[PDB]
Each structure stands twice: as C-alpha cells, then as structure tokens.
Amino acid sequence: KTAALFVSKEFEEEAIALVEGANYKVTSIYKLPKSPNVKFYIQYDKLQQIKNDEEISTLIIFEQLKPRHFINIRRELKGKEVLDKILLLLEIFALHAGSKEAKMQIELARLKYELPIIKETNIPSIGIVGYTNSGKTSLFNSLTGLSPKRYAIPINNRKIMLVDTVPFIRGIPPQIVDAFFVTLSEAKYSDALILVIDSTFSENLLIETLQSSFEILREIGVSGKPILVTLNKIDKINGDLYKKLDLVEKLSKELYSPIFDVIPISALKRTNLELLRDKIYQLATQ
Amino acid sequence: MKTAALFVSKEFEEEAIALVEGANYKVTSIYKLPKSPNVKFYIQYDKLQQIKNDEEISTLIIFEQLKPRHFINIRRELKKEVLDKILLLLEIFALHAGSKEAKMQIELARLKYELPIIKETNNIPSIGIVGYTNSGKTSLFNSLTGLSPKRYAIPINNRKIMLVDTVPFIRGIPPQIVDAFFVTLSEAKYSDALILVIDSTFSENLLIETLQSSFEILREIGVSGKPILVTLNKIDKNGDLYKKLDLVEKLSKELYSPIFDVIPISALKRTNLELLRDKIYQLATQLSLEHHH
C-alpha cells in the first residue's frame, strides 16, 4: 500500500514515522503550499499529478482537512484513498488496538469525523511505550525478528509477550483524544513497560521528552509497575553517551518508581540488544 | 430465517411483531413484559434459562429499553443474541439503509448504545413503498414481488420496475436513534415515485390523522414533485369502503401534488392487484415520458 505525503519540513520527521507505522509505503513526499488551496487544500495540478499515477494508492496530507477538501479531493481521485492527520492517526490507533472498547472508541471517532464529510454534499506481558520515531517499532521488530504489533518472543527458556503499544503523540487533535487514551490505557494491563527514548536529542529536549513520557504515564494511571528505560539510537549520537545515560537514569528515578534499569541500545545496529534480552529475562523471572 | 422469543406488552405487541418480522425474524413464542422487572436479568431467570437451552430459538427480543446491566447479565448467559427496542430498530434501519450516511448514522448510534454497555464492564424507475408498520406495506411488497429482499425488480409488460420496501413510518422513536431513522427514511426522497399505503381499518378521524401524518412525514423528509400513488389497503377487513375511499381520495388530492391516483386494495387477499399493476405500468410510462423530446 503506497502513499503520497504532504508534510512540513518540521513535522516531516513525525509524519514519515507515522505513515510507515501504519503499514503505508512512503512513495512520494511534498512540502506545504505556502497558501493552501480553498477547494483541494493542495494545488490542483499536484492533485491531478497524484490522480495520474498508478503507483499511488493513497494520498496523505499531514494536516486537518475540512469536509469540503475531502469532498472535492475524493471527487477528483475517484478510486484512490485520501487521508489527513486525524484519519491517519485513527488508522494507527486501530492497528495497536487490542481491546474491543478501544476498537469501538476509535471507530466512533472515525464515524463522527466522516459524517460531516458526507453531510456537506506464566507468560509475562511487556508493553513497549514511547514517542513515535524513538525507535519503538524498530526495537519491537529487532526483538521479534519481524505487522502483529503483539508478538511473544522466547528468551532463554521463558516465553515473553511483547506489545508494541500506541506511540505517544504530540499535538493530538481534540476529536480523537478519547480514542487515543482508551488505546494507550491498554498499557496498564502489561506487567512491565519498556520506555523508549531518542538519545539524539539535546539535554533540554531529553529532559522534556522524559518528563513528558512519564507525565503521560501518570495521565493514564501507571503506578508501581517496573519500567525499563532504553536509550535508543545511540548509533546516531554526535555526543557523549554516559553523560546522557546518567542524566536519564537520575531524572527517571526522580520522576518515577520503580525503575528496573536504564540501558543504551540501537535497534537498527542491534547494539546491546543481547544485554536488553538479558534484562528482559531478569525482569520476567522477577 | 431466524427465530425469536418476543417479550412485549399487548398495546405494542402487534407493532412489535411486524417490526421483528420486518427484521427477517419468525416469532415462535410471545410473552408479555414482566410485572416487576428482574433486578438482575430483567427477564425472569428461569425463562431465560428455558430460552437459553431451546435450540429452536436463536434470538431473544425484548420490546423495551434495557439497562446496560441487563445486557451484560443476559449476554453472559446466552453465549445467542439479545435485542431491545433500540438495537432492534437499528438492526431494522441497517437492512433498509442503502446510503453510506444512513449506514454510518445507524452504526454510530449502535456503537454509541453498545459503548456504555461494554463501558459498564435499461430505464429502471425506483418506486418506493412507504407507510406505517400497520398499513400492510410488507404484504403489498410481497404480493407485487411474489415472495427477504428489501429491493426487488418486477416485470410489468415490457417494462421492469424497481420496487423499494422503504423503512416504515415509526411513532415514538427513542431520541437516541432519531437521526439514524430520519436519514434512513429520507432515502425515499431519491425515488422517482412513491406508493403511500394507508390503513383503512382506522375510523373517520383516525384515518384522516394517518393520511395527514403520512403526507406530513413525507414532507419532512423532503419529498416533493414526486408522483404519489395512494393505496387504501385492507379493504377486506369493512362496509364503509366507499365512505373512507372518498375521504382519502378527496383529502389526498388536497394534501399533496402530484397525486397519480388513489385506489383501494387488499394486500392479503390480492384484490385489485391487477389494476394496481396497470397503474404501476402507467406510472412507469409517465416517468419515462417526463423528460423526453
């Protein structure tokens, strides 16, 4: 399932991750029209370009489109799929959804958002949490060897259920707030959690990401559950590791308890994944 | 065809049966609403178990609004569907609904209702047949069709007409599913013509009220300009036929335009159906000649 993405240079990092995570292939990428169109939001010529390309099956614009935009765009594409930020996020929610209640909440938001468009015409369970593009999915895939979003991997002689929960999202549209939390709250069930953090950030950003990640966990009601913090993407660090490791370790234990451990990793390069496996086992045994 | 056990009061029984059967159910057994609803299951536990073990009964239908508590307790026992008035009506709308908006409205309302529940855990004209759930609508549809399909094409001479068994007019609809019903019924506005079925078994004033209400509803849903063929049904059920016929004919022509014709029929006894078919054909001819040069 291919896709054409229209995202700003700033949110492009976020969008690409979300798109790929939604089982979509990023076949094309475009900027944001300085002055968005009134009828189609994107310029008509580009729209026709998307229409005239058998290699594109889904148009994705990382913004909130008005019903008239969907009406006109769909009226032009006639056969291809069109998605905005809200529809994209909802699709992702449904993928990570594990409970029926979550399914319904997600579908409810989708319907409420789609109506106006047609109107105007014992095995332990570990939950991997963190912001998108923190390496979460990559970490999950590296451990599983893989879109299950919930795979039980054998470590030593113990079988462990890994759950790639819905990623933390910044700037969540009010419409899908309920659907999001109901989906994320599925993490409360997990016996333990793996908090994934992007190490590439600076100190000011690391502190923010940590405080935000833990804040969100409090918001859903996570308490007393063992949390293993993994400093991911150490392969793309243009600085020092221990300095950030000690910072993260200290700040985490100040913001939450119990903290099982804090280890640096690299989902892509497999760096320290064997150590992670060991720590996951020690946690499972515990 | 699915079987169902119906719990309903006497005043709503007749309407309940028609609605249930309209949802493709054969009512095998009928009970009245419990004097004092069961705190736990609403329905008497013993009766619930009896229906639970009766393989000749696939679905339980209670013609009343159940509390989320009841749905939960009843469902953990049946393992068989349980339907209250709201879920029943929504299930009925879904069968008629052909538009995406209606489907979504119905589904929305359903997901809504279920949310708390689980949260507490060439040249083919369309002729729509409209009327109340007591006008013998379905019977007429089945007679002209020869029968369930909610839409069915019938051959008349050299023309073939698409008959549409639209959702019946329903009185006292739960506020929760009003939007779902309205949209589903509004689909009748996209028909080229309509057959308004009228229950003749009503008295003088009641008949007028039914007729007036029928046209009023047809107005609310946005029907206008469409030729309407009024059929005074159940003439076999008596005596003052011509009396009520004249009132209907005269009142109808004064209530709406254009009125194609007004004919008396008996869906069950299949009386005057041939004439009806003729009128349908003539109507089809008119519709095909409307925008011609």
Give me the CATH code for the B1-123 domain, please: 3.40.50.11060
The helix/strand/coil state of A94 is: helix
Chain B interface includes A205 (CB < 8 A): no
Asked whether the beta carbons of B269 and B237 are under 8 A apart, the reply is no
Listed in order, strand segments (DSSP E) in chain B are 2-7, 25-31, 59-62, 81-83, 126-131, 151-156, 159-165, 193-199, 228-233, 259-264
Burial of B53: CB neighbours in 10 Å, binned 0-12, 13-18, 19+: exposed
Residue A161: strand pairing partners? A125, A152
Method: X-ray
Q: Which residues of B touch A114 (CB under 8 A)?
A: 104
Interface test with A, best of B71, B75, B118, B179 (most A CBs within 10 A): B118
Fold of A1-122: Rossmann fold (3.40.50)
Amino acid at B181: F
Contact residues on chain B for A178, CB-CB shorter than 8 A? none
Report the residue of B75, B90, B99, B101 to disrupt the A interface, i.e. the one with the largest count of A CBs within 10 Å.
B101
Q: Which residues of B touch A115 (CB under 8 A)?
A: 101, 104-105, 108
Query: What is the rounded distance in angstroms from the CA atom of residue B291 to the CA atom of residue B141?
Result: 28
Residue A191, C-beta contacts closer than 8 angstroms, at least 6 positions apart = A124, A125, A126, A225, A226
Among B104, B114, B119, beta carbon nearest to A111: B104
* Spatial separation of the C-alpha atoms in residues A277 and A281, rounded to whole Å: 6
- Domain ranges, ordered by start, for chain A: 1-122, 123-286
Of B108, B118, B121, the CB nearest to A111: B108
**Token digits for B160?**
């073939």
- Which residue type, as a one-letter code, is found at position B201? T
Task: Output the CA torsion B108→A71→B95→B277 (10° steps).
Answer: 150
Q: What is the CATH number of domain B124-293?
A: 3.40.50.300
- Partnered with residue B3 across adjacent β-strands are B26
Strands (DSSP E) found in B77-211: 81-83, 126-131, 151-156, 159-165, 193-199
B159-165 and B151-156 as β-strands: parallel, antiparallel, unpaired?
antiparallel
Among the listed residues A30, A10, A25, the one whose alpha carbon sits nearest the alpha carbon of residue A171: A10
Q: Give CA–CA dist B143/B262, Å, rounded.
A: 18
* Under 8 Å between Cβ of B195 and B127: yes
Q: In what order do the strands lie in the sheet with A259-264?
A: A150-155, A158-164, A125-129, A192-198, A227-232, A259-264
Determine if the peptide bond prior to A258 is cis (ω within 30°): yes
Q: How far is CA B171 from CA B11, B87, B138, B210, in A?
A: 13, 16, 17, 11
Alpha carbon distance B19, B17 (integer Å):
5
According to the CATH classification, is domain A123-286 in 3.40.50.300? yes
Å resolution of this model? 2.3
Chain breaks in chain A (C to N over 2.5 A) after: 121, 146
CA atoms within 13 A on the CB side of A83: 26
Asked if B1-123 and B124-293 have one fold, the answer is yes
